[PDB]
């Protein structure tokens, strides 16, 4: 069984650096990419970059490229991410994830496994080429209802669109990849549709476990980008 275990929480002053680790077990480390995504408190998901344990190649989001370094150690099955020159807006939970199996060895893609996250708190000193949108941002529903969420890509992304569920206090979980392919172990009430720019996630009969935030993610080109999330809430 696939496991990613991340290092413990960090508290840093601005200007400092942090080095996070992610230990992989239960699979052939060099056959899959290892990538990093962060989430500021109460905010959405931001893709940081990708690393190949196979050949050492990396790609960093331009926003962060100057201050980030990602490496892998194939003798210990451990991935590392260093973020330098810290600022207040770097406070976030940092996740490592396993890019799912792809057409070529260790290619970046949707994450089929997530670390548990590392909180990095930067202490207080006072007081995206394909953007994605989601509609609605919030919706309330009752058990048994059909819930349908829209995703829109600002440029065509073919079918390179994934959907994730995130429950309060947990890492996200992959539901759908390639627009309409249901991930192993996900209930059949979840289904995805669309290609090009307009996509949908529908839950045919909402269950109590389904109240959560849902995110779409395009993986057509780097940098990968997430939609801002849709919260599915219990009716008041």
């Amino acid at each position: 069984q696939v496991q990613l275990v991340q290092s413990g929480p960090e508290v840093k002053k601005p200007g400092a650096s942090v080095r996070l680790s992610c230990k992989a077990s239960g699979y052939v480390f060099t056959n899959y990419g290892v990538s990093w995504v962060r989430q500021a408190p109460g905010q959405g998901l931001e893709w940081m970059g990708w690393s190949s344990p196979y050949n050492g190649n990396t790609y960093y989001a331009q926003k962060l490229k100057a201050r980030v370094t990602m490496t892998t150690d194939t003798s210990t099955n451990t991935a590392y991410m260093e973020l330098r020159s810290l600022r207040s807006d770097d406070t976030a939970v940092y996740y490592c994830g396993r890019d799912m199996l792809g057409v070529v060895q260790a290619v970046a893609g949707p994450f089929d496994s997530w670390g548990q996250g590392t909180l990095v708190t930067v202490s207080s000193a006072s007081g995206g080429d394909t953007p994605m949108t989601q509609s609605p941002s919030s919706v309330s529903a009752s058990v048994g209802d059909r819930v349908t969420i829209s995703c829109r890509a600002s440029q065509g992304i073919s079918n390179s669109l994934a959907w994730y569920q995130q429950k309060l206090g947990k890492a996200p979980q992959l539901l759908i990849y390639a627009a309409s392919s249901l991930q192993s172990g996900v209930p059949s009430r979840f289904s995805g549709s669309g290609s090009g720019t307009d996509f949908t996630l529908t839950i045919s009969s909402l269950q109590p476990e389904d109240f959560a935030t849902y995110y779409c993610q395009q993986t057509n080109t780097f940098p990968f980008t997430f939609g801002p999330g849709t919260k599915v809430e219990v009716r008041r």
Binding site: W50, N57, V103, V104, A106, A108, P223
Partner: peptide, 21 residues
């Protein structure tokens, strides 16, 4: 011949198989 990473632009498949120099 090989695919050099200098031309991979924003393409993830290229970045997965390219050789760095």
């Amino acid at each position: 011949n090989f695919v050099p990473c200098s031309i991979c632009s924003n393409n993830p498949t290229c970045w997965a198989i390219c050789k760095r120099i």
